[PDB]
Subunit: 219 residues, 2 copies
């Protein structure tokens, strides 16, 4: 259909993963917005949700869904979110838009990560979409230099300031052939807060909206 | 002599590493305070310093030493600082006091890390001194749980808030037999900003004040 319905079919497709009587972790972004819409449908069948962004929270709140803080929760059965890119090994790049840090923390608490996305987010090798990296301001230059040394071209998003008061460096031109080693290498750089690479903890399930329907990838 | 003179002898001992015409990275804490004092001595022989804490900055500034921000510098020849503990492999634990994050970032920019400390900081296996971990507030509980899973007993420093607006978890009871693998394991935890383990990048030189003088460990 149209890219946006490909984002709706996949939003509702994920509703089959929501289990009655549980708390749901929800992502942020247009694709995720459709899942929230679908989730509103089960208001009354679930306990609530842990939200990754104010936008999402404000929308969940508006559908009569109780939103728990991440510190009011011990664990999470599922976390449903989109991705900027996802390779064949379920490893993803996230953060292009909003909530890079919150999204990654909630995903670490979630047992199962359900990625919902249209076919355009599928890639062979992560890297085409610039890899976002949140860093402590005082270390921007330091980290910029390490990223160069790691093979990418850091481009500071002037004007932007995370809710945690940090800056963002979008790394271009990298051909991330081994996402796990790359996530590790950048997480090792002092000054780095979050790398938009969900490789050690990738998607467990992926709902991909294809014009022929919605393919489901697992494991 | 007295523990404090053991901290003064070692402060001045490090002055032999300061090279004329360069910028110096200075640490924070009582031991480092003695190095600053000694460094004031070469005011006029060096270009200035990159400071790891306001206290240090205010003191360097007071000795007529120009202080450059970390983003006004490309690299650093040396960084002189103390440590809460240091093992035989030059790996250390730092952050018990102040500036855990800034200290680690400056040390990453510095070519040579010079550790100055009295003999009490020397240990066989890191862990006795609680391992500090700076974390994004929203993930305190999350990280607390992972640290438990890694074998330590996280104890949140209630009341404290980093200059980066974060909280601190001091991890007790760990017997950090492999500091590199442990620094890697904790840096991998979303929510973690900085782990007070300088293992992938440890001390290159260690000036240890012993009653018999000042031993110098290298490599």
């Amino acid at each position: 259909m149209t890219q946006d319905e490909l984002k709706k079919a996949v939003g509702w497709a994920a509703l089959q993963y929501v289990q009655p009587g549980t708390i749901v972790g929800v992502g942020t972004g247009s694709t995720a917005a459709h899942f929230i819409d679908a989730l509103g449908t089960m208001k009354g069948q679930i306990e609530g949700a842990v939200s990754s962004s104010d936008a999402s929270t404000e929308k969940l709140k508006s559908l009569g869904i109780h939103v728990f803080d991440l510190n009011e929760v011990d664990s999470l059965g599922i976390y449903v979110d989109g991705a900027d890119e996802i390779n064949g090994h379920m490893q993803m790049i996230k953060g292009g838009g909003a909530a890079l840090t919150r999204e990654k923390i909630i995903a670490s608490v979630a047992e199962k990560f359900i990625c919902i996305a249209d076919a355009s987010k599928q890639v062979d090798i992560l890297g085409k979409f610039p890899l976002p990296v949140e860093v402590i301001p005082m270390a921007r230059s330091a980290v910029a230099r390490q990223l160069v040394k790691l093979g990418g071209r850091p481009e500071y998003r002037q004007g932007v300031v995370t809710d945690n008061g940090n800056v963002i460096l979008d790394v271009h031109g990298m051909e991330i052939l081994d996402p796990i080693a790359m996530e590790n290498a950048i997480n090792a750089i002092p000054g780095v807060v979050t790398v938009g690479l969900f490789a050690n903890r990738g998607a467990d399930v992926a709902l991909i909206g294809t014009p022929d329907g919605v393919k489901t990838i697992v494991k």
